[PDB]
Amino acid sequence: TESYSDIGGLESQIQEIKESVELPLTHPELYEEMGIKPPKGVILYGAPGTGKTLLAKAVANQTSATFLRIVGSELIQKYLGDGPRLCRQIFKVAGENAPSIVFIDEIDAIGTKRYDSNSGGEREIQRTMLELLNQLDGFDDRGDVKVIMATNKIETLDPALIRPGRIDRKILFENPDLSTKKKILGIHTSKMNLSEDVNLETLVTTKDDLSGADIQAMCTEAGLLALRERRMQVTAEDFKQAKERVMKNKVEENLEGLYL
Amino acid sequence: SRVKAMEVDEKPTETYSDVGGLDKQIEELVEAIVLPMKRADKFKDMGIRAPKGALMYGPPGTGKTLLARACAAQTNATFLKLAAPQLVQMYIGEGAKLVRDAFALAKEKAPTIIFIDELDAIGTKRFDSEKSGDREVQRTMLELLNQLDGFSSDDRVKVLAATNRVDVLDPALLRSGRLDRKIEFPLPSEDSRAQILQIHSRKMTTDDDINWQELARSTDEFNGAQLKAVTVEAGMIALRNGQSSVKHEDFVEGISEVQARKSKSVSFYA
Amino acid sequence: NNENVSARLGGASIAV
Amino acid sequence: SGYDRALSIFSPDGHIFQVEYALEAVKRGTCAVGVKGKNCVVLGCERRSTLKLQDTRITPSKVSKIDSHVVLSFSGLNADSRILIEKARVEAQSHRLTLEDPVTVEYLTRYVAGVQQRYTQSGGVRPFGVSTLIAGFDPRDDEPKLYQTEPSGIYSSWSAQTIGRNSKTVREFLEKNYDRKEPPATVEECVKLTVRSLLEVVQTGAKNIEITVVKPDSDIVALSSEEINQYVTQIEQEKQE
Amino acid sequence: TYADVGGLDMQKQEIREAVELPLVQADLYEQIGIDPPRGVLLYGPPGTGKTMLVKAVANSTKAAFIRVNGSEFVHKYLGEGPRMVRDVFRLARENAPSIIFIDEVDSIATKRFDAQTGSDREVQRILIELLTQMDGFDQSTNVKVIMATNRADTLDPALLRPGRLDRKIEFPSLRDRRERRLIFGTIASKMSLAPEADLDSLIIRNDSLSGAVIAAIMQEAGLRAVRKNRYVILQSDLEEAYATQVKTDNTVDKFDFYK
Amino acid sequence: LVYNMTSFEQGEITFDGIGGLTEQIRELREVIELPLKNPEIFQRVGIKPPKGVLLYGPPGTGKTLLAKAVAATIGANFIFSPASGIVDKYIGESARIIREMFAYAKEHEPCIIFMDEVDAIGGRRFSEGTSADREIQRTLMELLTQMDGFDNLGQTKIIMATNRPDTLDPALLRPGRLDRKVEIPLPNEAGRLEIFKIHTAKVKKTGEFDFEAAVKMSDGFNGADIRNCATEAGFFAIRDDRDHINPDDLMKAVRKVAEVKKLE
Amino acid sequence: DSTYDMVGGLTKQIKEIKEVIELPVKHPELFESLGIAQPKGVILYGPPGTGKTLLARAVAHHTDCKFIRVSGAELVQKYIGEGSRMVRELFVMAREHAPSIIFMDEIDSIGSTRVEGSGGGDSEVQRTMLELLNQLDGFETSKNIKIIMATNRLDILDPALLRPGRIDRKIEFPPPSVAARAEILRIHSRKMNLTRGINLRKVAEKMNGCSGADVKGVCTEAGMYALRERRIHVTQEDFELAVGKVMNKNQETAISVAKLFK
Amino acid sequence: SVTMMTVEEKPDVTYSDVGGCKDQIEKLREVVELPLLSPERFATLGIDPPKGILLYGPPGTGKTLCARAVANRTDATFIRVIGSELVQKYVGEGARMVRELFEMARTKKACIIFFDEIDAVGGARFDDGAGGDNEVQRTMLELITQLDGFDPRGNIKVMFATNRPNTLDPALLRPGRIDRKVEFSLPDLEGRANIFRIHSKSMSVERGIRWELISRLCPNSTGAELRSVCTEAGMFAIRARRKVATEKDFLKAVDKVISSRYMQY
Ligand SMILES: Nc1ncnc2c1ncn2[C@@H]1O[C@H](COP(=O)(O)OP(=O)(O)OP(=O)(O)O)[C@@H](O)[C@H]1O
Ligand SMILES: Nc1ncnc2c1ncn2[C@@H]1O[C@H](COP(=O)(O)OP(=O)(O)OP(=O)(O)O)[C@@H](O)[C@H]1O
Ligand SMILES: Nc1ncnc2c1ncn2[C@@H]1O[C@H](COP(=O)(O)OP(=O)(O)OP(=O)(O)O)[C@@H](O)[C@H]1O
Ligand SMILES: Nc1ncnc2c1ncn2[C@@H]1O[C@H](COP(=O)(O)OP(=O)(O)OP(=O)(O)O)[C@@H](O)[C@H]1O
Ligand SMILES: Nc1ncnc2c1ncn2[C@@H]1O[C@H](COP(=O)(O)OP(=O)(O)O)[C@@H](O)[C@H]1O
Numbered sequence A: 001t002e003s004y005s006d007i008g009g010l011e012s013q014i015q016e017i018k019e020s021v022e023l024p025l026t027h028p029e030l031y032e033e034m035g036i037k038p039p040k041g042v043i044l045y046g047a048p049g050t051g052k053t054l055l056a057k058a059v060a061n062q063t064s065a066t067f068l069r070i071v072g073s074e075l076i077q078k079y080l081g082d083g084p085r086l087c088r089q090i091f092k093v094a095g096e097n098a099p100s101i102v103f104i105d106e107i108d109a110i111g112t113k114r115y116d117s118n119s120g121g122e123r124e125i126q127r128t129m130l131e132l133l134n135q136l137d138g139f140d141d142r143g144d145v146k147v148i149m150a151t152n153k154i155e156t157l158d159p160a161l162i163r164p165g166r167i168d169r170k171i172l173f174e175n176p177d178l179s180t181k182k183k184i185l186g187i188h189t190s191k192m193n194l195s196e197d198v199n200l201e202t203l204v205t206t207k208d209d210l211s212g213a214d215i216q217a218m219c220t221e222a223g224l225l226a227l228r229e230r231r232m233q234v235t236a237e238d239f240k241q242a243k244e245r246v247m248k249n250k251v252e253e254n255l256e257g258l259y260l
Numbered sequence B: 001s002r003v004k005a006m007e008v009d010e011k012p013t014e015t016y017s018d019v020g021g022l023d024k025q026i027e028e029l030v031e032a033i034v035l036p037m038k039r040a041d042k043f044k045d046m047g048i049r050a051p052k053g054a055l056m057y058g059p060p061g062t063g064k065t066l067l068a069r070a071c072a073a074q075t076n077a078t079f080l081k082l083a084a085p086q087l088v089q090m091y092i093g094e095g096a097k098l099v100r101d102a103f104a105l106a107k108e109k110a111p112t113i114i115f116i117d118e119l120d121a122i123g124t125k126r127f128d129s130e131k132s133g134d135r136e137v138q139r140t141m142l143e144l145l146n147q148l149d150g151f152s153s154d155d156r157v158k159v160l161a162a163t164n165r166v167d168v169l170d171p172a173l174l175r176s177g178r179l180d181r182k183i184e185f186p187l188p189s190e191d192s193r194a195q196i197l198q199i200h201s202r203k204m205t206t207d208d209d210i211n212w213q214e215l216a217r218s219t220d221e222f223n224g225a226q227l228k229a230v231t232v233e234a235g236m237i238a239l240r241n242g243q244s245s246v247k248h249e250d251f252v253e254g255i256s257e258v259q260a261r262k263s264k265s266v267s268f269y270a
Numbered sequence C: 001n002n003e004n005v006s007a008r009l010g011g012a013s014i015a016v
Numbered sequence D: 001s002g003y004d005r006a007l008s009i010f011s012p013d014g015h016i017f018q019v020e021y022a023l024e025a026v027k028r029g030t031c032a033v034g035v036k037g038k039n040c041v042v043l044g045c046e047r048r049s050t051l052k053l054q055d056t057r058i059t060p061s062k063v064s065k066i067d068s069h070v071v072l073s074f075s076g077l078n079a080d081s082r083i084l085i086e087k088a089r090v091e092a093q094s095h096r097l098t099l100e101d102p103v104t105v106e107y108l109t110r111y112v113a114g115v116q117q118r119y120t121q122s123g124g125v126r127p128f129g130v131s132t133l134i135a136g137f138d139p140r141d142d143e144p145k146l147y148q149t150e151p152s153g154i155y156s157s158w159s160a161q162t163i164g165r166n167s168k169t170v171r172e173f174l175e176k177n178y179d180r181k182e183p184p185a186t187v188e189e190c191v192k193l194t195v196r197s198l199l200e201v202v203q204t205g206a207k208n209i210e211i212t213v214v215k216p217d218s219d220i221v222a223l224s225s226e227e228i229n230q231y232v233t234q235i236e237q238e239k240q241e
Numbered sequence E: 001t002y003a004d005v006g007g008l009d010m011q012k013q014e015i016r017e018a019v020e021l022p023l024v025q026a027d028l029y030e031q032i033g034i035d036p037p038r039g040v041l042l043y044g045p046p047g048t049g050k051t052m053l054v055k056a057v058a059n060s061t062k063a064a065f066i067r068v069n070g071s072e073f074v075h076k077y078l079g080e081g082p083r084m085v086r087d088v089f090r091l092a093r094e095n096a097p098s099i100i101f102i103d104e105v106d107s108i109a110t111k112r113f114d115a116q117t118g119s120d121r122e123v124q125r126i127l128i129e130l131l132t133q134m135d136g137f138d139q140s141t142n143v144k145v146i147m148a149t150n151r152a153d154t155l156d157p158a159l160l161r162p163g164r165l166d167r168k169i170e171f172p173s174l175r176d177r178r179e180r181r182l183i184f185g186t187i188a189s190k191m192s193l194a195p196e197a198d199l200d201s202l203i204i205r206n207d208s209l210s211g212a213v214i215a216a217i218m219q220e221a222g223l224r225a226v227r228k229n230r231y232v233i234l235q236s237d238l239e240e241a242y243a244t245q246v247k248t249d250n251t252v253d254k255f256d257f258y259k
Numbered sequence F: 001l002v003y004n005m006t007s008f009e010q011g012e013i014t015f016d017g018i019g020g021l022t023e024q025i026r027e028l029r030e031v032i033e034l035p036l037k038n039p040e041i042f043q044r045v046g047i048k049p050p051k052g053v054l055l056y057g058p059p060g061t062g063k064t065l066l067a068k069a070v071a072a073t074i075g076a077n078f079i080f081s082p083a084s085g086i087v088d089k090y091i092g093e094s095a096r097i098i099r100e101m102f103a104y105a106k107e108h109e110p111c112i113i114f115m116d117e118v119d120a121i122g123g124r125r126f127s128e129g130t131s132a133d134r135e136i137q138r139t140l141m142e143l144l145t146q147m148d149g150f151d152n153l154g155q156t157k158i159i160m161a162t163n164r165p166d167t168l169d170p171a172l173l174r175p176g177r178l179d180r181k182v183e184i185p186l187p188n189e190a191g192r193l194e195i196f197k198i199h200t201a202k203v204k205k206t207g208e209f210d211f212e213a214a215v216k217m218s219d220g221f222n223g224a225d226i227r228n229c230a231t232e233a234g235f236f237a238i239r240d241d242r243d244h245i246n247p248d249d250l251m252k253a254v255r256k257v258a259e260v261k262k263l264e
Numbered sequence G: 001d002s003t004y005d006m007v008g009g010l011t012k013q014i015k016e017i018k019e020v021i022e023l024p025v026k027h028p029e030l031f032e033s034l035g036i037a038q039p040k041g042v043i044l045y046g047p048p049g050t051g052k053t054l055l056a057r058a059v060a061h062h063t064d065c066k067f068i069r070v071s072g073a074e075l076v077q078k079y080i081g082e083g084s085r086m087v088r089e090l091f092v093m094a095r096e097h098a099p100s101i102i103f104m105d106e107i108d109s110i111g112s113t114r115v116e117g118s119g120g121g122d123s124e125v126q127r128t129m130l131e132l133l134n135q136l137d138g139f140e141t142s143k144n145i146k147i148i149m150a151t152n153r154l155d156i157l158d159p160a161l162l163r164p165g166r167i168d169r170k171i172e173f174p175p176p177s178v179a180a181r182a183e184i185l186r187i188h189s190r191k192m193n194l195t196r197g198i199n200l201r202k203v204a205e206k207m208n209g210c211s212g213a214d215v216k217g218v219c220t221e222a223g224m225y226a227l228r229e230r231r232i233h234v235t236q237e238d239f240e241l242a243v244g245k246v247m248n249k250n251q252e253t254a255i256s257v258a259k260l261f262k
Numbered sequence H: 001s002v003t004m005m006t007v008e009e010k011p012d013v014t015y016s017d018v019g020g021c022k023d024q025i026e027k028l029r030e031v032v033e034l035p036l037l038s039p040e041r042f043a044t045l046g047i048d049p050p051k052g053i054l055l056y057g058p059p060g061t062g063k064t065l066c067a068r069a070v071a072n073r074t075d076a077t078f079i080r081v082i083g084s085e086l087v088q089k090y091v092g093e094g095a096r097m098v099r100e101l102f103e104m105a106r107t108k109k110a111c112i113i114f115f116d117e118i119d120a121v122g123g124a125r126f127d128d129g130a131g132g133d134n135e136v137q138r139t140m141l142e143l144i145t146q147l148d149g150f151d152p153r154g155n156i157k158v159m160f161a162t163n164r165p166n167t168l169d170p171a172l173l174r175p176g177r178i179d180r181k182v183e184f185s186l187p188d189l190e191g192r193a194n195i196f197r198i199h200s201k202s203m204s205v206e207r208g209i210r211w212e213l214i215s216r217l218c219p220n221s222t223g224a225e226l227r228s229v230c231t232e233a234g235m236f237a238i239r240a241r242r243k244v245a246t247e248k249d250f251l252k253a254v255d256k257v258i259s260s261r262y263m264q265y
């Protein structure tokens, strides 16, 4: 349901999905003018608390097309031979409902190496990882259905499907830099009072090794923390006690201080 | 119905000039299973528990599925060449009814031999998720085996079996009386490897100035399956270059193409 | 013919 | 893989690993900047203000001179840096002994790299988790120069360079400002050039810095804590808005 | 039974009041107003006579009773262990007032290290099947548990606290002469032996012993004589027997191993 | 049937038509037959009947032919449980099999076990992979409690055959049960003709006798040697279609087939 | 069930719970007027025998919302790919009753950190509840559902669980102070009897911070040293007896003379 | 039934649009076309060609296109036995299809098939033969029972595929079962320089380009990382809004897909 004008930060990251999805419905004559067809596939690295799912739900707000809802674990089934049928179902109907989009998330549940196990159940997902491959690039083209898959860790996972033919760009997210923490803070705080203390360009600062999601906890944890003082509007030191808290157990550099 | 669909392979057979080497293995067999089939008298009259059957174990590509075809037409003893899988398939009310019919007919047409395939699908030592899926299979073969002798039968039916794994099986078949003679198929030595090489090649066009010896020396960890295949691809090389024969070179590059080496071949050597 | 087999419908299994 | 747990083997790409993993250690260390004017050199540091229990009577010091016409600065880790500093100053005073002549700076710089080459080649040894640089003047001339060194064992001659945290911000910065079209002349602009260069990292703490410069005729001079504190302000004086 | 047990003059008392007395007399506990206890634990080395005491209690409880040794829990298909464990405690409260016995838990009750496996990770959540039952939102006032172990210093402290195991008990060592004299008199008196009765010659020895070895010596001494085409009595030349109960000599790894 | 033969308590192989021993077999006569025969004494003393036995030694001794044979004299059900063929890689399911058989044995009224190669149970644990070796005792320890719990029966006897004794020292499981541990022999040179007299019977061979057989049987003292020599010596009189054995084939047999029985 | 008079030992923690729970339910209008966020569920870590589960049975007595429970490992299951089904069929039962707290006592069986050599279905059903809390439709579920989970030591777990956006608070339940330890005696004693000329703070100050639940053990045990003798009433010296005893054995195996160091 | 549905029906792709694999085809069409086109030259020597060849290689190396490139070329029936159509539940409903699969083929002549990604079923080497019931064990032993033991047929060509060969049996390296193990592997320069050109036909770039620079600049890479170049290279001009491509554009397109510097060289 959300929109743009609700992120601010991700700009180097966001131009791609625009170039994959939001744009080609508009002005495909650009791509063909060169003699080129856009990607069939996208993926998003992890580094959590940085706005992955948020991005996907945004484009759903303005896409003028059919959009889907899957997490990696809805694919799997129990009867040992019906899982992989389900994958071919969703892709053919998308063609029937084309132009369409999908979104498979947390697919580290599915995507793992060919572990060569001995269980009897862990096999029936590997085949389920495989019809996808045989469906997605496989043998025959599929048309204009695009993938926006996500995860949280890939550095030893997602073996082979991560290649061109299936996915073409690999956006990655991290905890932001100092420059982005500026504008992102304006986002959440643009409904409160902010009585007179702002000083925000020292409130957020490097060595605040935090996320791009904890800030809204800090924003909201302060207001009630001021409310309980019977003061609805806000000052700075409301936020100071908060940042003292939420940062407390992120990291500790006790092994640092050696590289003098 | 499969028993009528199955028939003896007595009519087309290798004719036994095609096997190479294996001096003592077959000599062990004929001394153990064949001579008694023609001297049923003494092994009832001299008084002795005859060899009821025997087993051969060894790795693939080695002459298991083959050798059991030679001995039959060699000796004019009908049979069937059986398949553990087609028993084990989704049909369940026949795995027992079939094997009962198995020795039934082989009891007829006497004297006869009978032989089975790899026991990978019916070794079935496992007490895993459900035993009753298959325990009605072996136990009939056990009882059907017990039909063979025990009260001075001399039924003239004799049994053999091949399988790679001599360890996963039921340990109820090595028992005394039923069978006690498990045969090892060793992997071949060099003087044994070469007869395998000529014999899959006499049909092929060649020259006479080969020394087949070191070609065997180049091959270790190989036997018959690994051997004829290079005996194939040499001729396959002969056309792409355009020959009307196969030279010594074409064989040895066969070796280099078993595993696709494709060496740099000029890397600072001399 | 309601001989509906159990489908051999998998299930996990601990190792070693 | 397994190609990266030693110093005497090559990955199939051809490159060894344990060396450029050192370049990840040195990235975890403090800044160390250097610039040469027309006739004077400077050097910086990202000194820390850790806590109110280190003796102000003895501030620490990244910099460490070896002879009255050469200095040295580094970043990485200090223990493995302490050694080659002592193998350096030893080697220089020997060259005065044997030859009755001070050291050309290039000769020195090839001795410190002449050990960072063996301490990676022959196994049974770990490298020096440190990059360094040299600064000073040759005897009997005003020719300015600074050389860099790194644990692969190679020596270059930059005119400006840094090592460590957010160096990537800086080595692009001076490229945008410093240039051979207009080489600086004297101290107060080489320093006014440099004190602003630190600011990507210093986050406005002036208890977190030191500085030195260089003389001809085999001299040096250190610098105070107020003698920057004004330079904290002229650099901010431009930053009115 | 009780009278079949020898020298448990102390230990015998704590459980026959931590088990029998409440269901027969509980109104007096609350006549103060307190909640009585639920679990106990019996830790001592093997042969010290623990697994048999409950069997005496089994004869005399007038409640229900359940036997599950710790190895019975696990299976290959995960998830079924705990529901088996849940099947237990529901069966108990159903047939209440009831209690439970386990003969070993050291295969389960451990320290909960940092696991990185399936095996070592699935055993733990079995243990969690106990904790969420023994003290969670749904509890009761009819169940009691009789744990057991050959030794108890490793199983996690989260299991060891009040509410769970209010009364855990020790057992003697193997070198405590008073009960040793009490056992030989007990076991021997249950059957017929000789007048030449040199049993006040064996107790005095410095050797350590259990209640298990004693069943061996007095049986296998009853073996050698009954083997002698004899009828009842055991000759005073059972000196074979005591020395036949020297298993340290029968351990080459206790003879030619460390040196 | 599903598992094993059970011998129907009467399949009467001859425990004396054998070149084995008299002392050991009479040592076993005590622990099994005497109570089942004569409970008037163990009752009179009140001692419970015995708990199992071990029969160490490597093969050739016939340490399984006597077992089912004497079981046939008394008439119990003889089965197997080869520990090599009981282990399963899964966490449980090695102990489940133990639990089936003590139950299923009791489904039958009498029953006796013949475990073999039980060193698979009693391992030294030199690897010390706690994911595994924590379970090895788990299934083992279940045996100790599954075997002697409440079972106050006089029918369910136990045997364990264990080549390589004392390889096990995780636990010797000494105290209590194993009321005997028979000092097993090997086939002495005197016993050779005690053995050759066994298998030679049921033959018309002009005798086929010799004193050059124990010298041939020297170091080939395993029962399979004699079973097989009589086999192949039987295959040499037919090598020429003769009518009766000559003893030279025996002097040829054991001399020329104990070779494999001494080198590998 | 039990109640808030019985969970004495603290107020700062419990005064932070309904800071997130009771307010949005009863009074979101100010929080919609202020209109900023919606703080979702909570975690509470601490050593065992401290009152974690106790606060969670009380709160249900004082909630007015529906309060769903899952005990230890009743979601991990035998067959495959229905543990997830056992999850997504849970929350749909919540949204029927828009104000719905859930509770899961322990997560260290499920939500342990992930690896590849082992850990299958459990590391999958965690990888979809992690979706349900903050996904597309989770934004729908994110409206009114609240969550409470009560681990023992949290370093084991992932960060993604305790990552904010869904876990906005991480409460500590440490072992108490003297007066905290001192009161809960009364909360486990007032039923007892007209205890005769007695103090209870002089004994708490004897027993330094051990835990809370232990104190339920001394009081129940103290009466038992008086129960044997048909001495229905209660003594003083029976207390510093027992508390001096039951922790001795806890201080028995802590000793060791390895000392390869100083 | 369903097997009749899975049939190629003419995708458009040549051998002109494949590059560095200029010899690895010379093994592949040596077994397929010639016994079906020119069997007389073998017959002049009179021997048995191999049947049941295979190909294995890294992912995205360019094997599936060949398997359909050979389809339109031959003008013969092409058959796709793809996954999710061999391991359905209700045993008997699974392995009957493979029996029915060949039966269509045994009937018809001039026929070749395709097994896409056999690693599912063939790759299921029995886990130490464990499992009291192994549904894939039974259906793998049938096709080797089709193909080995005795001859299935005399004129039918078969090709498998595998991203990962070490899975399946040691019985699928063996004549009757399998004859050849072709290996597609990474290109060299003179192959890449003929893979760029095909993917840049459509592209609207202007000359002044020397891909010899690029191949020296693109190390070990697949035949699919070399099309993605052509996308992003052509794309950067779009956000920069130009109606033509440069060369320098490729130089910052190459840097992404392959993906702080080795200053020691
Ligand atoms: N720029 C931003 N503006 C507002 N909120 C942000 C921004 N970046 C991150 N967030 C917060 O981060 C949360 C989303 O985190 P993320 O996208 O990682 O969830 P996810 O896709 O499920 O991944 P994970 O499973 O790691 O949480 C949102 O709830 C949102 O509040
Ligand atoms: N002694 C031999 N003489 C001739 N050919 C041989 C010999 N040994 C092996 N071969 C060759 O090996 C192949 C036969 O191997 P065989 O079929 O007996 O093993 P297999 O049954 O395939 O093994 P498995 O049962 O494991 O599949 C034939 O190609 C045959 O030419
Ligand atoms: N401060 C307290 N107030 C009331 N009861 C307490 C207090 N501290 C301990 N208890 C008692 O301790 C027990 C609760 O233990 P606690 O809830 O701390 O462990 P737990 O969280 O249930 O363990 P887990 O949830 O890990 O199984 C109850 O019997 C309770 O009466
Ligand atoms: N020589 C080539 N010329 C043009 N494109 C190529 C070439 N080689 C590979 N490709 C590209 O590779 C893609 C197909 O990869 P392919 O399917 O062969 O890899 P794969 O290992 O079969 O993948 P999977 O194992 O998942 O089937 C095609 O989109 C194609 O553009
Ligand atoms: N006081 C005793 N009198 C007679 N027998 C005893 C006595 N104590 C122990 N035993 C013997 O020891 C055995 C119990 O061993 P135990 O230590 O309980 O092992 P576990 O606790 O592991 O089951 C019993 O079978 C019993 O014969």
Ligand SMILES: Nc1ncnc2c1ncn2[C@@H]1O[C@H](COP(=O)(O)OP(=O)(O)O)[C@@H](O)[C@H]1O
Pocket: B176, F018, F019, F020, F021, F058, F059, F060, F061, F062, F063, F064, F065, F195, F198, F222, F223, F224, F227
């Ligand atoms: N004392 C003996 N007398 C005669 N034959 C024997 C004797 N011992 C063993 N055998 C022969 O060996 C076989 C038994 O093998 P055995 O040594 O019992 O194997 P295992 O030791 O594995 O049980 C019997 O079939 C028998 O023919």
